[PDB]
Ligand binder design. Structure first.
Ligand SMILES: CC(C)(COP(=O)(O)OP(=O)(O)OC[C@H]1O[C@@H](n2cnc3c(N)ncnc32)[C@H](O)[C@@H]1OP(=O)(O)O)[C@@H](O)C(=O)NCCC(=O)NCCS
Ligand SMILES: CCCOP(=O)(O)OC[C@H]1O[C@@H](n2cnc3c(N)ncnc32)[C@H](O)[C@@H]1O
Length: 633
């Protein structure tokens, strides 16, 4: 079953099937003309001359786009929209409590970004300084990210659900000079500590770089205050001049770092530059969502994740959209919350995640009860695979069978959408990301690196660069080259597996490395094992993912205690809380399986394939039998 392109979409679409085909072929055959022309979606301070300048050569990866052009992201997201659209809403903010919302016009946002840019400059922040942002889903998170970009500071946004230890690791690695936070965030009626977590983070004796903490009063909770270091947001911004002249950034000036979990090691800072990234986010946002002036757009992703960077803030604002920032969760106070927000603000484009869809579907019709949903023209899904059944529930209940669903496959490392439908150009298959975006050349290779032709499956690689590609890993270009460009030479390895069907549509099966997907959150099995083994009573651990109906994968941890320690309710609780402390609640094992029987190769390497199979139900060979009975209990 292919879903046809509906007439209302065909009548209005920016790109039809023929235009998709033609532009696709040109992006591939002639990237310099294609991306040379498409780069004009942005305003450049000085024009680029060179367009594509890239190599995936082994141990010698170099990615540059538009390299001689200069520009300012904040000017593209704000300034250039003032003359025509200064009165238009830039951001609709919907509170965790429905009595709370705000409309923030382009003019108002610009003025606050200008005030906050001066605040930053007056505080001593300079172009290239890294600024850590640990904020909830409030408009001020946006102001802080845009102010940083405006001055050429390099923001590093840390998701609010990270623990103080996780916050400190990111601060240490990036040498962040400043932390921007709130006293607390508000989520599903609960107040979540943020500033306290920062206080704990800065007590780590390896944190040396942070000179100030800017705190937004979001809840007025009693916090500890260090005079001098700590500064209230309101105090600072109100003293700052609202006049700020944006300076030109080179196309290859660093824009942001985003810590991202890998197959091995601890999270690394995926680094995006300015020009290609922003051309790519604005271009993909515009065509995949079929954005028309006046469309109300809603991405539900947190600002702490890449989806929140590219498609909550940067892509939409570049295009002059009204973008909605929701503080809470789609099913609080009730499962109908998400659709209530859609009606309240007349959302035309809704972009969400399969975990949220599956949580709402588990509530059947309570998800749509009392709601109208008519304003909706376009639906999106990203972050994890969506089965045909969930896709169909989404298409029917939320979109009322009237809205194309754009299932967008991509990654932190890709900056923007990679394999995705375009709503007026491509016919949909439930559960398929479908076809590559402009400038994207995917392939499927076997474990030896041989391309597989026709209907097939294999390792999903991208065989050439695209403007939005991550340029490096902060402080570690060698690890960037190793992780992504060493498995299959001269190719970008995504670490995902995929099938290609008889039509040439891609079906992403999931990570083939040791990376988990837990409620749409990318986590490394290695880092969770490191966190566990750091516990004074734990000798060894092996972490796998198991299928879970809502979350996609749940975390299953095999744990070996040091001699002289026993399993108890207490130790169970302590070990789970230890992971919460090391990483955050998102990384907490759902199951602890206590064992002295980790399977290992003769060289001592833990073999996870079998652990994966046992946990799901599907040197010393005796360990498998012990493991089987332990699992059954
Ligand atoms: C958002 C949604 C997609 C799934 O939620 P989720 O991302 O998996 O996270 P949850 O809401 O379950 O919370 C898990 C933990 O992470 C924390 N967390 C999640 N987001 C956070 C954030 N933005 N900032 C700080 N902490 C956060 C929660 O507080 C909770 O921690 P705790 O139990 O130790 O106090 C959607 O299904 C939803 O609204 N969840 C309902 C709550 C729930 O029970 N979810 C589990 C599946 S039903
Ligand atoms: C939304 C982008 C999130 O970026 P992150 O870097 O956090 O996660 C990237 C990984 O999410 C999965 N993934 C993402 N989108 C899809 C998708 N649409 N279908 C299947 N899997 C997906 C793929 O496994 C991918 O390697």
């Amino acid at each position: 079953h292919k879903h046809a392109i509906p007439a209302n979409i065909a009548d209005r679409c920016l790109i039809n099937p023929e235009q998709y085909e033609t532009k696709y072929k040109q992006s591939i055959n002639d990237p310099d003309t294609f991306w040379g022309e498409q780069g004009k979606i942005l305003d450049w301070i000085t024009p680029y001359q060179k367009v594509k300048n890239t190599s995936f050569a082994p141990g010698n990866v170099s990615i540059k786009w538009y390299e001689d052009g200069t520009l300012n992201l904040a000017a593209n997201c704000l300034d250039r929209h003032l003359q025509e659209n200064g009165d238009r809403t830039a951001i609709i903010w919907e509170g965790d409590d429905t009595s709370q919302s705000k409309h923030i016009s382009y003019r108002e946002l610009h003025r606050d970004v200008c005030r906050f840019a001066n605040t930053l400059l007056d505080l001593g922040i300079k172009k290239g300084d890294v600024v850590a942002i640990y904020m909830p889903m409030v408009p001020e998170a946006a102001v802080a990210m845009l102010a940083c970009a405006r001055i050429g500071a390099v923001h590093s946004v840390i998701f609010g659900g990270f623990s103080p230890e996780a916050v400190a690791g990111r601060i240490i690695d990036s040498s962040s000079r400043l932390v921007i936070t709130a006293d607390e965030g508000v989520r599903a009626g609960r107040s979540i500590p943020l500033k306290k977590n920062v206080d704990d983070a800065l007590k780590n004796p390896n944190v040396t770089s942070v000179e100030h903490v800017i705190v937004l009063k979001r809840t007025g909770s009693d916090i500890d205050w260090q005079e001098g270091r700590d500064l209230w947001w309101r105090d600072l911004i109100e003293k700052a001049s609202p006049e700020h002249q944006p300076e030109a950034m080179n196309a290859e000036d660093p824009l942001f770092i985003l810590y991202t979990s890998g197959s091995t090691g601890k999270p690394k800072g995926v680094l995006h530059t300015t020009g290609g990234y922003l051309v790519y986010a604005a271009t993909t946002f515009k065509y995949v969502f079929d954005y028309h002036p006046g469309d109300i757009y809603w991405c539900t992703a947190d600002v702490g994740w890449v989806t929140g960077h590219s498609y909550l803030l940067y892509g939409p604002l570049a295009c002059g959209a009204t973008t909605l920032m929701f503080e809470g969760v789609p099913n609080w106070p009730t499962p109908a919350r998400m659709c209530q927000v859609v009606d309240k603000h007349q959302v035309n484009i809704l972009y969400t995640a399969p975990t949220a869809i599956r949580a709402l579907m588990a509530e059947g019709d309570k998800a749509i009860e009392g709601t109208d949903r008519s304003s909706l023209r376009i639906l999106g899904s990203a972050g994890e695979p969506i089965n045909p059944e969930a896709w169909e529930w989404y298409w029917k209940k939320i979109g009322k069978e009237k809205c194309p669903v754009v299932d967008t496959w991509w990654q932190t490392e890709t900056g923007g959408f990679m394999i995705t439908p375009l709503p007026g150009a491509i016919e949909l298959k439930a559960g398929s990301a479908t076809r590559p975006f402009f400038g994207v050349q995917p392939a499927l290779v076997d474990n030896e690196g041989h391309p597989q032709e026709g209907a097939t499956e294999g390792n999903l690689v991208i065989t050439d660069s695209w403007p939005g590609q991550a340029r490096t890993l902060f402080g570690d270009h060698e690890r960037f080259e190793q992780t992504y460009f060493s498995t299959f030479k001269n190719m970008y390895f995504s670490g995902d597996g995929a099938r290609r069907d008889e039509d040439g549509y891609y079906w992403i099966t999931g990570r083939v490395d040791d990376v988990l997907n837990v409620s749409g959150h990318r986590l490394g099995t290695a880092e969770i094992e490191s966190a566990l083994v750091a516990h004074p009573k734990i000798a060894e651990a092996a972490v796998v993912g198991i299928p879970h109906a809502i979350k996609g994968q749940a975390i299953y941890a095999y744990v070996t205690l040091n001699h002289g320690e026993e399993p108890s309710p207490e130790l169970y609780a302590e070990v789970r809380n230890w992971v919460r402390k090391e990483i955050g609640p998102l990384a907490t094992p759902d199951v602890l399986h206590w064992t002295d029987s980790l399977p290992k190769t003769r060289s001592g390497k833990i073999m996870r394939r079998i652990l994966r199979k046992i946990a799901a139900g599907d040197a010393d060979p005796g360990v498998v039998e012990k493991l089987l009975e332990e699992k059954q209990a």
